[PDB]
Amino acid sequence: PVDVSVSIFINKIYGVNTLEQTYKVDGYIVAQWTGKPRKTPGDKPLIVENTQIERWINNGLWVPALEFINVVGSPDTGNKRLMLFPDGRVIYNARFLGSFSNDMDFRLFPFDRQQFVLELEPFSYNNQQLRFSDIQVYTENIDNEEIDEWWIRGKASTHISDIRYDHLSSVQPNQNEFSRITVRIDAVRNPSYYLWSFILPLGLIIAASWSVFWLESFSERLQTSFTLMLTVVAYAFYTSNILGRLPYTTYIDQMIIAGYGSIFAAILLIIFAHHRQANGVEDDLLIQRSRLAFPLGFLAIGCVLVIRFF
Amino acid sequence: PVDVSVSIFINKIYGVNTLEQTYKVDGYIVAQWTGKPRKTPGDKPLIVENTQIERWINNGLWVPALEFINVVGSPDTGNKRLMLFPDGRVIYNARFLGSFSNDMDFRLFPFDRQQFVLELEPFSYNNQQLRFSDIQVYTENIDNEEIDEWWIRGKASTHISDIRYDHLSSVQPNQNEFSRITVRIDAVRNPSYYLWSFILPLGLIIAASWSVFWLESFSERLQTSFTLMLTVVAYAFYTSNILGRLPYTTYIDQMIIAGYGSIFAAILLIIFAHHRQANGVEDDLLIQRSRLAFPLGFLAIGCVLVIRFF
Amino acid sequence: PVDVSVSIFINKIYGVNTLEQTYKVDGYIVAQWTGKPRKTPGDKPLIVENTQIERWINNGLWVPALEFINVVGSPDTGNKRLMLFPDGRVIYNARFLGSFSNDMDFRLFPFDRQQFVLELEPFSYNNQQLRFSDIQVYTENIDNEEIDEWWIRGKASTHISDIRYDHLSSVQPNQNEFSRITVRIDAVRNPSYYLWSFILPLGLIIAASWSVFWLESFSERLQTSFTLMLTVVAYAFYTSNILGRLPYTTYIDQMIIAGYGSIFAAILLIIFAHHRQANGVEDDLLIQRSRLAFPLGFLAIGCVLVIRFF
Amino acid sequence: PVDVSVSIFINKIYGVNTLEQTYKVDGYIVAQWTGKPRKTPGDKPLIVENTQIERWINNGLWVPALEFINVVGSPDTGNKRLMLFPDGRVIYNARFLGSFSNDMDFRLFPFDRQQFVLELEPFSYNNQQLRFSDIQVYTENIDNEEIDEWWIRGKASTHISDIRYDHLSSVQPNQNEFSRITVRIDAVRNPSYYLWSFILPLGLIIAASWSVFWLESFSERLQTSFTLMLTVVAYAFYTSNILGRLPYTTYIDQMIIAGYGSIFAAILLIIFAHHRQANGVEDDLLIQRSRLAFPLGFLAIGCVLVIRFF
Amino acid sequence: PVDVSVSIFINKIYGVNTLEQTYKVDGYIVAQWTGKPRKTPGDKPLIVENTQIERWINNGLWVPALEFINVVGSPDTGNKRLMLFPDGRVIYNARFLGSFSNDMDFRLFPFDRQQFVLELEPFSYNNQQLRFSDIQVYTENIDNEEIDEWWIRGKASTHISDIRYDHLSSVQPNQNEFSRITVRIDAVRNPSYYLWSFILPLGLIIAASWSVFWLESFSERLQTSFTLMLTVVAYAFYTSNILGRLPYTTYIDQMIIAGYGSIFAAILLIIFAHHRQANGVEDDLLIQRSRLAFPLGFLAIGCVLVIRFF
Ligand code: NA
Numbered sequence A, B, C, D, E: 001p002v003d004v005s006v007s008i009f010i011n012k013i014y015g016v017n018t019l020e021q022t023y024k025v026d027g028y029i030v031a032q033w034t035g036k037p038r039k040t041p042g043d044k045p046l047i048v049e050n051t052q053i054e055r056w057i058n059n060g061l062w063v064p065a066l067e068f069i070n071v072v073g074s075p076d077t078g079n080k081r082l083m084l085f086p087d088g089r090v091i092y093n094a095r096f097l098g099s100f101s102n103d104m105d106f107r108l109f110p111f112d113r114q115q116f117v118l119e120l121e122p123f124s125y126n127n128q129q130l131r132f133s134d135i136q137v138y139t140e141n142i143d144n145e146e147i148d149e150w151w152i153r154g155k156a157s158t159h160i161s162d163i164r165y166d167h168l169s170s171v172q173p174n175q176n177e178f179s180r181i182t183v184r185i186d187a188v189r190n191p192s193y194y195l196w197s198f199i200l201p202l203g204l205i206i207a208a209s210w211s212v213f214w215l216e217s218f219s220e221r222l223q224t225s226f227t228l229m230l231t232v233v234a235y236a237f238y239t240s241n242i243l244g245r246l247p248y249t250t251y252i253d254q255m256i257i258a259g260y261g262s263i264f265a266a267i268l269l270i271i272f273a274h275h276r277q278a279n280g281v282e283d284d285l286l287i288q289r290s291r292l293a294f295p296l297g298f299l300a301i302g303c304v305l306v307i308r309f310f
């Protein structure tokens, strides 16, 4: 097997689409191996740029094709370069730009942590014909910077693993295992936008639905509470436009459902209090003493959720 | 005819667009046949990577082109490989990525079952010149996993059939029949999102439209019922943004229409009860005793629909 | 001139975008002509697949280029095949996939009839150098099936016509006329979706705006009528999202405008009836006897429109 | 310099996107010049189709590259043809399809007039090496027809001008001037859709806000006026979805702002009239005699704007 | 090292997408260096157009590849030209069209200033093998013109810097530093559209929420204030559709939050004033004397923000 030393430089990470759980990575990939010694012009390394490597490949040069595994579509390669040394080592440098994909877990959606994963693998050569010795990832242009709502924390984690493929077992009986490189870059979401944009107005709506209990007439207590309840119900598909149609509820979705239950319980309570007015003149005080307890119960539920979930 | 043995490995399934009834399938296709014996470097199989197969094709190698039938657009192939054996068998390995299409049936839309179908066929060779012997599909990366709202259940079903084409009857008189491979992967939709996102708020809206009957004034019974009816009518195009403009009603569409009929019948009933107040003082009790029967009728209709339809 | 016999097989029709009046057609095109006799391997027809026809074209084979006239963008061709016979006839088979365009006429929009037109023409050869003898269209995969809201009725109509071009008159003095093939496939829209999705809720809204006349108070007659009128006005851009910004009104647009006029005339009538209450106690009966006539007038206008327009 | 005679045939104009001020033009371009006499097969002109012109260019044929200046992206060329005459004239015919761009001026937006401009220029040859003699534009497929909301009026205007480039002054000292062709096709917008779709409902909303003054109670005069004012305010971004975010107001935007001012002045006037009721029983007649003057003032402002602006 | 003199001509700047912080730049790039003297046809410079430079590169011509650093995707190059002089200087002229990217800072969003940055760099040659001598940018087509909401002010600023890459340190031990060109074009946003489209209606909404204090009844003061507060809350995601989901508040976002606080404080104040009516007849004057102070406080906050922030 040949020892291929890979260096990946990440130019920028952009286009993080959480609706499709994809992201776009820009940068250069440098793959280095050693072959037979050759004669170059002078005693200087020879640089073979793009649309000239194919002449060397037709002449008989061994340049392996390294593919990215977790891409959607195909990586849009740009300029590519081949460097040949008189001592006999070949360096393949190319620029990639592809839409990678990774599984994302949105339980704690405003305060969420995922990672961006690049997976590299030879297309045709197994570990008995091509081995990855090591990878150094040079991530300093995005080391501590803020992609539009994501913070990059820590350095990139590298790993080399061998992946066994059973669809190549018929064509390769005992040698169908492929060397792989995984590069993981941790990202932490910035919750500031949601804090000033969705939690702040919805908190004020729920505060108004708390303060409707202080009114002295049934019609004002009823129609304004219905208006606020329908306003909170109108926020149902807020998450589904940012994220996908996930089968689970986030913090924001749970807060919206808590708003549903709060204002619906308020409506049911005031309707029951009006129904208990059998003669139209009896007024209840114990069932209307909840003007402080009901927001206190909401805050208790909120703080228990904050303590337990985080 | 030549015996071509196909192995399809499914990398991932993503981008299931039910509005256009398309989906994207990633993976590799391995096609193997046997030809004449040849001389390779040493006694080892020879690997011919991409942009080098065309040299062998120009030299006179027979590499058939297998196309995908049910794609929209063209499949975006990536790296492709050719493996030549000294015993005389040729293996064509390539990576595909295309937007396939299949007919989908959305009667039971939240609790729906479709399948993802890959159809493979030679472009130019009939069954008298190219036969498909067998296909083994290796589907373990998506075996029991959850695509964004779909569950993959069971193993992939394979079938080999011969398809007769009448547009090739003039150019091929008695031999216009083509061998085909169909790969079917069953998928079951996850109804959790709709259960907590659309059925839960709409159920509470219909519960409020039930509870409006307990009010003691006509204006409160009228304007709140009109507001809830218009709120339910505003949910008319909810399905048409997820699915297409289907000619049939789903479970969700039938529930929305049931909400229409429920709140409209409530409005008609309270208007008729107000109109029967000829002197402005007579109050009706039999026509207003439906405060428990009307939700009971709605629940009876719902449970009969659940029992009969499922 | 050479006699070119064309056979077009339609695989599927999809992506009917009425906003841009385009549609996507999949299938294969088979063009057959006769040339000089040639020697093939054995006495069997020779199949030349893709990226190998150019070798024969460089050697001196005459393969004309047939273009599609009414496409938007360029047709995304896939595999293409060339078949050569020892008797001396050449068959060019290729797969096309393009976004065709045709003029559409949306007067009777829910109950609408357009056709899908494929226009084929040589790019460079006039009728004195290339003639189309006949075309047989093989349309059985979409013969009687339902594209998402369209029904295919009847068989495809074929026509061969000669088209004269005046921009080639300077470069070709008396021979600037080009043979053409037009393939027309009739389509009938399914009105079921609009019937259960837009006509059914809007009919109930107009029925409520009819039933507001039975109320015994001016404020209830006024604010609910204003709410229903604004609800109907909110449906103004419903057609412009499905179709384009057409200069004419459809059935649905005319029904929406009839809703405008109905509820606005109701508002004007109740305001005039309130204004005639000079002393605040006189009640009018003749001007409020229209509770049955006004929906009867709406139904009369509707049935006259249905009889005359259809 | 060589004399190049250009003929442009416009197939169709489609996709007029006023949000980005681009449009798509389909058609063929015929460029004719004269060179040295040559020998063709027989005494007949020789037609060289696509992917065969490059052989003649490698052999030493001078085929200049004409580029389009005002395109966004690159023009998607289709089939291209080369015609060679024994007398020694070369004709280059090709089909283009590109997204052109032009500056648009939306002051009189419903009744607006722009033009579609095609600009053609050699890429590398100045006026001392390539001159454009004349252009004839053959525009009969779109001569008097209606693109989706645009009317083509008059014939296309042609102009030949020389454009001087200062970025080529260092590489070409005294000869950096390039011949150009501009083709202008006037277009007039159809205002029918906006007339029946936006002016008609907004006119009825403003008429209702006029008729609210006839009500005899302050609450009905206030809440309905607020509802209509908020309805008119909701139409603020109607233009920004059709056109761009233009720094100027159109006719429709000015009508919406006039609706703002009208209903806000009505609200201020009724609030001031209620505030002048110091004892709660005094009624004002002079300040409420504006029920005919205020719509008369609105109509006077409208007719002065119509007379002066048009 | 070779001295490469670059001239960049900017044709147009369009498609400024502030949601993704990208923009599209059209124009031509002229790169000039000097090599060995050569023989041309005659004593005239030789122009080598596109798809003919590769013949010279295969023959052994040194044409370096200059890439753009800050692009998203790949630049869509069009025609490219090579000019060879008998004195021995090579000029590479090409047309580029790419979607560049730059960091944007939206604190003062309506009155905002960013710049458009083009970064050019060799792909494979360091400063010891290729130096950039100078760049002249010819920006007269966009010198003082208005891109759709941006004004170009001043002339373009040019800079030449050397960039050190640590991912090439293993393959190039002491020479891994690359020469770069940065071209900066200042842009100033036009705030007119937002001034007449969002600040003008929202200012009138806040003025109405000021004027609700003059009403003499609690229900009119309450329901209209709630309607205006919900209307202002509905404007929460106005910025997120133009810009991104930024973690900071702009001028418009701060004005919307000030509207939240203003109308919520008005609602709390009127509810507290109603609650202080213990007997239902006592009226407060000091707490309702704020009808002039509360808008005065809002204007004071606004003018302090205008003075301090600007
Ligand atoms: Na009300």
Ligand code: NA
Pocket (backbone or CB within 6 Å): none
């Ligand atoms: Na409302």
